[model samples]
Target chain A: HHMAIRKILYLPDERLRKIAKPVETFDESLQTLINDMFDTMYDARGVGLAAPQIGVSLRLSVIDIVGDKKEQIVIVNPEIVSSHGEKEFEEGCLSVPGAYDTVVRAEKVTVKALDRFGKPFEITGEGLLAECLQHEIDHMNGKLFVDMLSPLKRMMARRKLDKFKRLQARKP
Target chain B: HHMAIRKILYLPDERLRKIAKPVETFDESLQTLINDMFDTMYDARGVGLAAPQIGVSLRLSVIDIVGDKKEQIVIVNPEIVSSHGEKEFEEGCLSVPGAYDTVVRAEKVTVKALDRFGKPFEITGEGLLAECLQHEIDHMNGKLFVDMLSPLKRMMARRKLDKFKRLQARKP
Candidate 1:
């Protein structure tokens, strides 16, 4: 995956709508993908990205909520193990750019997934991590953050996407 | 300048730095452009938009920072007549999405411009208006929020823009 096309993220790109597949094993390509994902995320200033969110269409994902160099976390074939409670937090997606919304999510949960090296591991994230995990998983299921917004907001978001397309056509 | 090419409002689009000309006469099309600019801002959920910010090379601008539609201000051929002492404010520009920086600007500003109907008007703004006017004026002069960022941060922002261009290449 050395040059696997690194799709630049943007609003109204169909690549953002994809659902990613699970990585069967941690191999050189998978590791490369993970590294590239980290590069792309950091380069884009995103806290998390699912493979599908990058147009890879895989169940794999990555996150770095800590905002520190040493805090990087890559999850392959990630799945939520346990979840509880509810909290609403302001959320924004790299795919949707300026669209920020409040979504209720698990306050804490354990996630099981393989690392970039293909070793299985599990860890629990509270607060932001919990929300991030849920948001990333939703991408695996072809869901966007706008899905959790109010119906009116969802339509408005989609309408904005539509208008974005037209605007780009005319002015871009 | 009918059918002026729409400027790319995407992050790091350099054209956002160009100065815009003031509307000398109340042309119906000018009013129409103002309405569309308002629509564009509301659709983008942005607080303010300058004609130059939209890729049109002009001094006209529209702002609805209140978000309640109570004070939709459209200024044609605006000039910063006077202002109070300089102060720094954390500001974001619609043209530079997902980017923010602290910029030094007048704490209060006296603005002179024509309303949509071509009547002369003078208004003073402080706080949010001051920051916004300064930001929009920067657009009129082809400046960007990134210009106010530190050299390191500014280069980092450019790197992000480069990454985005690469991502778009991934699909194309």
Candidate 2:
């Protein structure tokens, strides 16, 4: 089977900051896109991926956190119902490769979303899942994890990203 | 928006010991079944699940190890290509529930299987993913994590499981 691995947009790319449109149709094409998204995520070794990261302005995201067990989650047309508590963890984004920083996020999250089959479901997550759900949902709303970082940290990340970009541009 | 959460089979059930048949047809129903497997796994708060555990005797399993990132994996008609090193970890089961024990497993595993869309792929995993992949694949061959325990440890697990069964029987 042929699977399309979508390209991830990087920092300074205005597209990563654009709010995605809600999915109006859930069909074979939608399913095909999701399958390709998983392929792209695995290829990038990324735990989470959002539609906007792949240049598709749709409210969709996929996440897989590996600890004692895997917590793989998919959210389509997701809406965060509620979040509680405060926690901080080191986070990295596929869109902003090589830029890692501590981010503050809710410790617990209740999210309502549509499954791949367009079935409505609610999932409550804690720890990493809570953080990832919020992070990916933020992407749908045109936000990045760097936005939650301290101003100094965000500035440092941008500097490093710029240096990384320059080095990529120099590559043959 | 109806999600099917399949019931997991517990110990002492004949189905848990029977070898799951290889999947023959891959189509929309297969896709639907995989989706349901994930829903059932997440609903049970489990890291891994097999078709036999859900009363379907097919060589299919889903695993997600929750930690820093989501390592959700699906193996359909998986065949272990090779394994290396020796490692042991405390493992639990969705089917057995509450029976956790140390079990020996390969430190690394190379497996060939089909993705959710019936696309053939190979994955070489280490640490948790390796252990989870092996554990779930073992289910297809009618094996459980407890089976890897020493004879005496297996006996202890059986004794504790009987107590759990009695407690369940007394529940209203």
The lDDT leader among the candidates is 2
Model 1 lDDT tens row, A1-172 = 5455456566556767765666776568777888778767755657788888677877888887744447778877888989999997766677774455567889998999887787889989897788888898888887888877779877655655565555445553
lDDT of 1 by residue, B1-172 (tens): 2333333376546566555665666777886788778767755656678887667888877886544345778777788899888887755555654344567888999899888788889889997778787777777888777876789878755655565555545543
User: Could you tell me which 10 consecutive residues in candidate 1 chain A have the lowest summed lDDT?
Assistant: A163-172
Error of 2 at A133 (Å): 0.3
Fnat for each predicted structure, in order? 0.06, 0.00
lDDT by residue (A1-172, candidate 2, tens digit) is 3246677898878888899998989888988888777666655546679999989999999876541113457799999999899987657787875575667899999999998778899999998679889999999999999887778877866765664465454333
For every prediction, compared with the true complex, DockQ reads 0.13, 0.02
- TM-score of chain A taken by itself, candidate 1: 0.85
How accurate locally is residue A2 in candidate 1, as Cα lDDT from 0 to 100?
Answer: 46
Task: For residue A52, give model 1's deviation from the true position in Å.
Answer: 2.8
